[PDB]
Amino acid sequence: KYEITTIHNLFRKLTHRLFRRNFGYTLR
């Protein structure tokens, strides 16, 4: 439910500036 979304480059965004706001949905 967490790392399941991140495989290789999917959620491996080196610059999580816009995804950081979305991560809140996966972390919580």
Rounded to whole angstroms, how far apart are CA atoms 28 and 15?
21
Domain boundaries, the chain: 1-28
By 3-state DSSP, what share of the chain in percent is helix, strand and coil, each rounded to 5? 30, 0, 70
Rounded to whole angstroms, how far apart are CA atoms 26 and 16?
14
Rounded to whole angstroms, how far apart are CA atoms 22 and 16?
10
Whether residue 23 contacts residue 16, with contact meaning beta carbons closer than 8 Å, is answered with: yes
Method: NMR
- Residue 14's Cβ-side half-sphere holds a number of Cα atoms within 13 Å equal to 0
